[PDB]
Amino acid sequence: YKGYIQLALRTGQYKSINVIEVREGELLKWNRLTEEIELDLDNNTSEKVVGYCGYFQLINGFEKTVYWTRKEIEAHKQKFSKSDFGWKKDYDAMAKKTVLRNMLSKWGILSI
Amino acid sequence: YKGYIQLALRTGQYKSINVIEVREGELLKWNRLTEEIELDLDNNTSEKVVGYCGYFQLINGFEKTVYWTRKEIEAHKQKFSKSDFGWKKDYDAMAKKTVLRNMLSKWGILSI
Amino acid sequence: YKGYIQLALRTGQYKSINVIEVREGELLKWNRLTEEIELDLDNNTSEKVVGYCGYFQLINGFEKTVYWTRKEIEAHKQKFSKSDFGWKKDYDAMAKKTVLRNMLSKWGILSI
Amino acid sequence: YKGYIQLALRTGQYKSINVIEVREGELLKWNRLTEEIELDLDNNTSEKVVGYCGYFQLINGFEKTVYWTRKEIEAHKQKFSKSDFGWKKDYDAMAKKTVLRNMLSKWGILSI
Amino acid sequence: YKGYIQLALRTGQYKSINVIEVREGELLKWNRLTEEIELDLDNNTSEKVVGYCGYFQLINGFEKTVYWTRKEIEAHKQKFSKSDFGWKKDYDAMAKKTVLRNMLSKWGILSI
Amino acid sequence: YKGYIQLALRTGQYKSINVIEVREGELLKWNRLTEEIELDLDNNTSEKVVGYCGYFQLINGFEKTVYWTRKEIEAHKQKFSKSDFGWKKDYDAMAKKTVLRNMLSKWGILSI
Amino acid sequence: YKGYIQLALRTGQYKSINVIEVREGELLKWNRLTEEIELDLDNNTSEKVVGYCGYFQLINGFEKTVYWTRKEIEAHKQKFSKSDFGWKKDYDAMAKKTVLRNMLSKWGILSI
Amino acid sequence: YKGYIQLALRTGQYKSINVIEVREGELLKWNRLTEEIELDLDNNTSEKVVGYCGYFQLINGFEKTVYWTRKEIEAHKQKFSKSDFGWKKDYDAMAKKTVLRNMLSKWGILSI
């Protein structure tokens, strides 16, 4: 993936990129059609995360939002992944790296 | 198709683009004349997709919606497609790429 | 025609445009004076198209409907068209492109 | 005339406009006082047109009907028109353009 | 007068308006008290007009009829009009415009 | 008075209204009790008017007739009117407007 | 009283109503039993009114006549009326309005 | 009683109805068998009424006369009436209303 981030930095036409995790009872409602999402901070009771989100905006004003839950990531690990040694040590880091690599791959522009 | 996406990004006058899949018992009703579509989320029982949809809106306020079902895609694969090795591995990805290439081709503006 | 679509997009005062085909036993009744048309979906028995229709609405609320049958298109191809190589490969695409070019030409506004 | 259509489109308070030709044995009866007209379709025997008609309705519900025959148009061409090169090539297009320009002129509202 | 027509259109509570000319041997009998008028079409021999008429009906069902002859118009031109350059070019158009302006003025409702 | 006519039009329950002038040797006999009046047209010799009349009929069949002569109008101008600049320019128009305002006032129904 | 006239108009079953004043030396003889009254016009010498009369006839043929003199009206003003500011300005209008209100009240039919 | 008058008006087959009071030294002679009554007007000296009378005639020519004196009305008030507050304010109005109600009741035809 580090090659993908290297190419993204060498491209030099992006403005901002961010990936975060949304924990139980944090957001209000998400739309899968118009990409409408709203979130309220410091109002929560649990300590277990429920999903992941990512926001990427370019210098020309174009923006993109992606949101995933546990069902898709478990389906992906059970049909594509073939390693399990790192899954016991941590649960989120490899999920984040997969999210980044896919979002950079199928939408992101690459330059050499 | 990646050339088409490259040209679309280099054009730099679009605002948002999205392509999704609509699964059984998700939308309410679709109009083929006025492009009127409404969808209700998290209310569904099955696990088999039934159609595909796409929404593309420009920076000037112009928007366009496209919706396809299985009949048109199977007709297209039986009259135009000549390869079948990838159809057994996955069923949706190539359908999505065909949808994108056609929608970019016959409506989308291109620049060099 | 692609120049006409390019000029239409560069104009930037339209709201929605659509062109479709009406197949046998689909619509109910059409008025050629008040442009009154009503259509009932998923109630049909045949597989042969009978006409073409187009709806174009602007951002100011103005709308326009056009509907053509096979008689006018065959008269047009027999008095104006001088090529026949593409007519055997497909039957509808060039009819649609002629409909678009005429409707953009004699009503549509153009800007440079 | 194209300037008149441009001003009409830039006005942005109209709803629908249409101009057609009525051919022999098509309509039933026309009233010149109350603007009462009724027409029956697909019941005709000849192939020679006999008159022209136009219907224009605004967004506020106001509507207007105009109907002309060959006598008025021949009187107009013999007292006002000074050119004849285009009359041999076609017979109806310039009659339609005169109908549009007059109806837009003496009733239609114009804005700058 | 065009200002009067502009105000009438901007009012937006009228239904139909018409002004015509009645030529010799066209109508049957007219009543100046109950506004009873009846006319028979395509039964006439002369080619010289004898009077003018106007019918104006609102959206609420109210209707009004006005009919004038040559005596009143010649009295009006000889006591009020002060120009004669346009009278030789045409005879009816200015009579019609005076009829419209008076009927809009003394009965018609105006809004700003 | 124009406000009175505006209110009358906005009321929307009237059927017909008319005000005319009766000139010397025109009517036959008038009744002030049963409102019986009969008039014969195109049989007259003089050119000086002698009285004014008005007929107003509603949509429910109710009708009303009013007839005035010069004595009442001269008494009214000498006891109520305080202006004389317009009396020399014309003699009938202000008499008609007074007739309309009084008849609308003391019988006519008003709505807001 | 205007409410009484409003209710009378909204009733919509009357045919004609009239109230007049009879001046000295105008009528011939009046009967208080059979309501027989006869009057001769344009034969009079004085200029002082002596009484008031009213005729009201329905659509079904029923008619009613009422006639009053100065004695009854002065008795009524001295036993019922409590205001005198308007009596000096005019003498007849309030007498007429009292006649109308009483005749509408004790005979007239009212509807809501 | 107003209900009785309402029903009488809704019946719509009457022609004339009248009720009056006969004062001392007014009539000549009355017959209780053949209903023969004759009265001479404007020949009287007193100012105290002595009786009441009523005449009612239909559209078919049928007529009826009723005449009452003070003896019958005082007998009726002393055997039937149970209220006395209104008798001091006026003496005749309630007598008239009783006459009307009885005459409408025992002879008059009623319809619903």
Numbering used by the authors:
A (entry chain J), B (entry chain I), C (entry chain H), D (entry chain G), E (entry chain F), F (entry chain E), ...: 110 to 221
What did the authors write?
Some bacteriophage encode a recombinase that catalyzes single-stranded DNA annealing (SSA). Redβ belongs to a large group of proteins annotated as the RecT family based on the protein from the rac prophage of E. coli. Here, we have used single-particle cryo-EM to determine a 3.4 Å structure of a homolog of λ-Redβ from the A118 prophage of Listeria innocua that we will refer to as LiRecT. The structure confirms that the RecT/Redβ family of annealing proteins share a common core fold with RAD52.
To determine if there is a similar structural transition for LiRecT, we prepared a complex of it with just one 83-mer ssDNA and obtained a ~5 Å resolution cryo-EM reconstruction by single particle analysis. Surprisingly, the LiRecT-ssDNA complex also exists as left-handed helical filaments, instead of as rings, but they are not as well ordered, and they do not stack end-to-end. Using a monomer of LiRecT from the complex with annealed duplex, 8 subunits of LiRecT could be docked into the reconstruction for the central portion of the filament. Due to the lower resolution of this reconstruction, we could not fit the ssDNA to the map, although there is strong density for DNA in the groove above α2 and α3. Strikingly, the density for the portion of each LiRecT subunit at the upper rim of the filament is almost completely absent in the structure with ssDNA, for the entire length of the filament. This upper N-terminal lobe of each monomer (N-lobe), which is formed by the αA–αC bundle and the β1–β2 hairpin, would likely clamp down on the DNA once the second strand is incorporated, to form the additional protein-DNA and inter-subunit interactions that are shown in Fig. 4 for the complex with annealed duplex. Moreover, cryo-EM images collected for LiRecT protein without DNA reveal smaller particles that are much less well ordered, suggesting that the filament is assembled on the ssDNA (a full data set without DNA was not collected).
